[PDB]
Amino acid sequence: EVQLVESGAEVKKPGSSVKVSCRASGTFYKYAINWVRQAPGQGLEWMGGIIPFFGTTNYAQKFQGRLTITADGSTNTAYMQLDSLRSEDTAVYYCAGPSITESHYCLDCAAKDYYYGLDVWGQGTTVTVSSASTKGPSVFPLAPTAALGCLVKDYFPEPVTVSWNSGALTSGVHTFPAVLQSSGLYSLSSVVTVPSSSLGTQTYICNVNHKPSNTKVDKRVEP
Amino acid sequence: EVQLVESGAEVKKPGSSVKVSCRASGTFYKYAINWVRQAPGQGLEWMGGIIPFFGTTNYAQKFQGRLTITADGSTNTAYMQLDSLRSEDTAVYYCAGPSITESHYCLDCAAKDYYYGLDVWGQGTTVTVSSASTKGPSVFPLAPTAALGCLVKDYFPEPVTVSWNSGALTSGVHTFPAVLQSSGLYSLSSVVTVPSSSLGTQTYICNVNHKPSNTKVDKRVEP
Amino acid sequence: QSVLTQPPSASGTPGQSVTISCSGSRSNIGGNTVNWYQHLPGMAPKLLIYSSNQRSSGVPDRFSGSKSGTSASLAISGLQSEDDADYYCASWDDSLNGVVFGGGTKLTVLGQPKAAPSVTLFPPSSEELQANKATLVCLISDFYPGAVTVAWKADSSPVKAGVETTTPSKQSNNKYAASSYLSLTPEQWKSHRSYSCQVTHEGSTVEKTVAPT
Amino acid sequence: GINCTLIDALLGDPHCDGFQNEKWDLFVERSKAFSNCYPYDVPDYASLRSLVASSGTLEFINEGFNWTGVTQNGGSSACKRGPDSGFFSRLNWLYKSGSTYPVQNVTMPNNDNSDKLYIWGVHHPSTDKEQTNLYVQASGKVTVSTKRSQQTIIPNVGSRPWVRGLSSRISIYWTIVKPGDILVINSNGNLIAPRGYFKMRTGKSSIMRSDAPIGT
Amino acid sequence: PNNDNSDKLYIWGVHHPSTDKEQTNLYVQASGKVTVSTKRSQQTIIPNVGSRPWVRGLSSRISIYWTIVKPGDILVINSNGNLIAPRGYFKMRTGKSSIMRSDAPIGT
Ligand SMILES: *[C@@H]1O[C@H](CO)[C@@H](O[C@@H]2O[C@H](CO)[C@@H](O[C@@H]3O[C@H](CO[C@H]4O[C@H](CO)[C@@H](O)[C@H](O)[C@@H]4O)[C@@H](O)[C@H](O[C@H]4O[C@H](CO)[C@@H](O)[C@H](O)[C@@H]4O)[C@@H]3O)[C@H](O)[C@H]2NC(C)=O)[C@H](O)[C@H]1NC(C)=O
Ligand SMILES: *[C@@H]1O[C@H](CO)[C@@H](O[C@@H]2O[C@H](CO)[C@@H](O[C@@H]3O[C@H](CO[C@H]4O[C@H](CO)[C@@H](O)[C@H](O)[C@@H]4O)[C@@H](O)[C@H](O[C@H]4O[C@H](CO)[C@@H](O)[C@H](O)[C@@H]4O)[C@@H]3O)[C@H](O)[C@H]2NC(C)=O)[C@H](O)[C@H]1NC(C)=O
Ligand SMILES: *[C@@H]1O[C@H](CO)[C@@H](O)[C@H](O)[C@H]1NC(C)=O
């Protein structure tokens, strides 16, 4: 029922601190809200959890002292704060919780009794820890069944997201994994395959999104 | 055990108000902290006392309305505030208290039961009440057993303090009572007598201090 | 060095069954229920099994979990192409006082038909040509096995300078995708009469061509 | 009573659930009886045990109280129902919903031929954190009243000795509502609510302490 | 803990200041509370502030309470002010002992 939405991708200098938010779409306070990350090439790593009802926290000892997990009951939001960022902290950070309900709740069990299998996940927030400057992308149309697309060139850091007609067009869409140029910059492309007859009318607009530089760009694609 | 340290010398225009602080070096709250002054040429005059534990004050009736004695428990500090300064208030202000301890304390006796003979005194704070402008001193070296010294010239008001090698040199030191020029300004001199052979090496630095103009000056004395 | 220990890989053809084991200890598995997760990275994990042996909602019955002593198993019988993914076990650990995850097992479903790559080539746009830069884009998809060599041609003359090419990477539908970017000066683009992107997959070359007019 | 004291069968300590709605001429309390739910105390315990015993019945009638903006059926690890947490069967542990515990103000008219016995309670947390976690307000209060009587209890916070894991306590109270009279319950926290009433009867019923076995 | 063969009688008290100044001077907190408890009993007393008639100089009062701790039972005392604490316990005994009010002199 409930869905979790995490805050947008960030980029941080080493040493600095980061705070990611998790917003539930409904009351989601009685059971353990978990934070779990994945660094490039690693398996999932559990950071810790809070039980909003009691405000109770459990942290993986590896992060004790720089990890703070926090919750606010009125706005149905959980937060994760990680200080003294090293580059190992570059990862996708997920928030997740269980969907169980109970007619008879326990007001005094042990923390672990409130942790259940995580079946509701946020989409994940990419935090990238680097000294490099943030650069937004330049968006250019790729004019044309038939194949039309967008070029998202020269940006940092990952990630970037590309939708079509404000989310309306979904079939035929293939965004491509990015490239890592020598210059340190990235680039990617998104393609939609459509019938070649409905080119002359229907309008295609790519919605290119890059949160670490706060860059929204909509670009129109015509032959 | 405990030592009291009072704030620095001040100078005030008539009508104005003055607040002197007394900082204990340890908990000093259970018994009566006394303020006692001495104006030039007069005997000791008792201003009043506070008993920090209860916040209880006793004032000499002569000062009622312009004397406020105050205490703060966390920082082990007592304060004395004297308003509407006349020139008769020019004096050295001491703070003092008893060193008694008690295994069984009385939580409800009369004020006077908390006053005991004063055996711990602060160093005293010179408050001088005048219309004249404050002037800091000019420090000059007096080059040379043998006798070397510092000249502290043209300043106001009293007092001034002179140490040697940051307090290290104490034997042979003789600072002289100041002079009162016609110009209203003061001047003094401090002399150290040393062996005349250890002139060629060991370094002498006088630390001249004048708080009413916030003037610290260290001066090096060589032949 | 995760507290729970999985083998790093598993494989099978469609229809077989695979068993992914999780090895823990008294303080975790031997005293707590085990969960299993599935993950097709970039997109969030999904719960498969809770309470050691219960299928979560919407999870096909071919998935099953079990526990005994200080280990746990996930059994996938009648394997299907969609199951190619990462699998993780997790449980509470009473000495760590928190949750622990296994190091994951990558399950590869084998025996896909060999598929040739679709290539779509694009020229420098109006805007980009205007900004004094030139980028050709070669979009390569739907192939298997996931390995291609990219060579860029100018008319007929090969060019190795200015080329960036992404390593292949699984799409949703189990076939691989890849891109290649040839950067130029706009003067290099308006001089030759055409450019080409040759793509080699399993000793077979597929090319597409683009031109200034 | 086997393992149960009368008061435990009244409140509905889980191992005493077999005594629900029972009648007796003589109730026999055994020395081996034990409590196994939330640790509690009864002010004038002797009097409560007396008046119930004299009534001769544990006949219970559920009623729906209009609780608003609070959650019901809170349970404890000190009072398990099998493997999972539980509570006294005839009482209703009320707590916050979302992040508020609004004031409760409910009524229950006696429109019946007979007197009603209401059993209710007040929760004494071990810490201020516990207090605010459950009831949001820092200071609870419970007021139960008829037309000719009131009892307002302030909950007290602080540690008591560990009993079945807890430093906390519940205090049990009672209220008899006569026909024509009206019960009102007022609380902004710490209320252990009644789920209804016990029938009151008069007659030859009593209670006795003995370990003598029962014979035919 | 009572680890002994016999019952313990604890005598303790609660202090009722005459003014709020007195209350905070002694206990810092504006409102005290005292809780004394065993496993099967508790007593929480809130101190009350205000003037009573002068008695031997004071408007203040102390209220005395008691608590009996049985063997195996355990005493806990909780307070953030106004606690008049026990220094130990009185032995409890049973027997023929009593008390009487009289001004008759004692004889041999
Ligand atoms: C105010 O002061 C009171 C009184 O001291 C404190 O109350 C104590 O609180 C602690 C928990 O903080 C209680 O400790 C628990 O004791 C349990 C029962 O003890 C049994 O075993 C002991 C020792 O072998 C025997 O002596 C005793 O008779 C019992 O048979 C233990 O079983 C518990 O252990 C469990 O928890 C610990 C963690 O605490 C785990 O590590 C263990 O694995 C185990 O699962 C536990 O330690 C203690 O009993 C309380 N005493 C009393 C008299 O109530 C309050 O904590 C304090 N309040 C505040 C907020 O400061
Ligand atoms: C709230 O209201 C109560 C009740 O009025 C006030 O209580 C009174 O407080 C005053 C002090 O403020 C008490 O005064 C004291 O009375 C002592 C006993 O009285 C004896 O002598 C009188 C007169 O001769 C007889 O009538 C009486 O029966 C007794 O035999 C006096 O001995 C005290 O005198 C001493 O203190 C004064 C200063 O106050 C000195 O100047 C004297 O030298 C001497 O040492 C004293 O005056 C009075 O007794 C209290 N009455 C009662 C009923 O308690 C509270 O003050 C008030 N609370 C607040 C905070 O406002
Ligand atoms: C009463 O208590 C003991 C201990 O729990 C138990 O073994 C026994 O079965 C109980 N008796 C009955 C009849 O329920």
Side-chain angles (χ1 to χ4, degrees), chain B residues 118-138:
Chain B
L118 310 164
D119 65 324
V120 180
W121 290 70
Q123 76 281 6
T125 293
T126 317
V127 176
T128 325
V129 180
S130 186
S131 317
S133 300
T134 325
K135 185 173 198 274
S138 314

Side-chain angles (χ1 to χ4, degrees), chain E residues 18-19 50-55 58-59:
Chain E
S18 316
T19 63
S51 296
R52 288 84 172 178
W54 229 232
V55 166
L58 308 177
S59 291

Side-chain angles (χ1 to χ4, degrees), chain D:
Chain D
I2 309 174
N3 282 338
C4 291
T5 58
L6 184 57
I7 297 314
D8 287 333
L10 186 78
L11 307 171
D13 185 343
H15 88 297
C16 297
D17 285 335
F19 288 94
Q20 296 197 339
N21 301 310
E22 287 284 351
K23 274 163 245 160
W24 62 85
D25 288 332
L26 188 63
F27 192 113
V28 179
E29 284 180 329
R30 314 307 204 158
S31 65
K32 84 203 184 214
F34 63 88
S35 293
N36 196 15
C37 196
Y38 215 96
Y40 70 101
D41 77 287
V42 197
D44 215 9
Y45 185 96
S47 284
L48 176 65
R49 169 185 190 265
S50 181
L51 73 88
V52 161
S54 202
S55 189
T57 179
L58 285 183
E59 170 173 1
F60 188 82
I61 305 297
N62 290 280
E63 290 171 325
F65 291 95
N66 191 8
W67 312 114
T68 300
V70 283
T71 316
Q72 306 178 44
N73 310 296
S76 165
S77 57
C79 188
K80 281 175 257 286
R81 229 115 196 165
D84 14 30
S85 89
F87 199 64
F88 297 107
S89 73
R90 307 300 187 177
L91 297 163
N92 188 6
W93 196 352
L94 299 184
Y95 60 98
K96 64 173 193 209
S97 179
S99 58
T100 20
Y101 187 113
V103 165
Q104 302 303 302
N105 184 43
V106 305
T107 316
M108 200 59 67
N110 188 346
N111 294 313
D112 292 317
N113 42 335
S114 31
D115 281 354
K116 299 183 188 166
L117 174 59
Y118 285 100
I119 312 309
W120 50 275
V122 180
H123 183 221
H124 306 290
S126 316
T127 63
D128 302 317
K129 237 294 158 165
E130 181 187 356
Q131 170 68 35
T132 46
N133 280 156
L134 302 183
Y135 318 115
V136 195
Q137 283 77 251
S139 173
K141 78 183 163 199
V142 172
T143 284
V144 180
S145 42
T146 56
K147 290 172 171 197
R148 199 250 203 191
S149 82
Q150 54 162 347
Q151 293 158 275
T152 291
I153 274 75
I154 302 299
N156 320 299
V157 167
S159 296
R160 288 84 172 178
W162 229 232
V163 166
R164 293 179 284 294
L166 308 177
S167 291
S168 303
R169 296 295 193 268
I170 277 177
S171 282
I172 300 303
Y173 294 87
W174 74 92
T175 307
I176 304 202
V177 183
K178 270 158 169 192
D181 202 348
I182 295 181
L183 186 79
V184 168
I185 297 174
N186 202 244
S187 166
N188 71 335
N190 313 66
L191 167 63
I192 305 300
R195 301 185 167 281
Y197 69 91
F198 287 96
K199 276 224 54 215
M200 302 231 73
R201 292 178 178 265
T202 58
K204 66 178 210 184
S205 274
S206 186
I207 186 178
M208 185 183 292
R209 298 179 182 105
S210 174
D211 291 325
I214 297 195
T216 307

Side-chain angles (χ1 to χ4, degrees), chain A residues 38 43-44 46 58 94 112 115 117-119 121-122 140-141 147 153 174 176-179 181-182 188-189 191 219, chain C residues 32 35 37 39 44-45 47 88 92 94 97-99 122 125 127-128 135 137 139-140 164 166 169 171 179 181 183:
Chain A
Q38 182 180 45
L44 302 175
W46 181 84
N58 287 66
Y94 302 90
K112 73 175 247 183
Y115 287 67
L118 310 163
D119 65 324
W121 290 70
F140 309 100
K153 184 89 183 167
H174 191 198
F176 282 62
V179 61
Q181 301 186 121
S182 46
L188 65 85
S189 309
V191 185
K219 183 61 78 150
Chain C
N32 291 274
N35 302 122
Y37 297 87
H39 192 23
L47 183 67
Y88 295 98
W92 190 265
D94 295 293
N97 251 114
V99 185
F122 291 105
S125 74
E127 288 102 294
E128 202 204 329
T135 297
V137 194
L139 297 160
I140 311 172
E164 320 270 11
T166 96
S169 88
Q171 309 171 167
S179 303
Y181 297 83
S183 290

Side-chain angles (χ1 to χ4, degrees), chain B residues 86-106:
Chain B
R86 317 132 183 199
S87 43
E88 299 92 66
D89 295 314
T90 286
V92 166
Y93 289 78
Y94 302 90
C95 74
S99 72
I100 5 120
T101 67
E102 288 181 299
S103 52
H104 299 77
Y105 187 60
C106 172

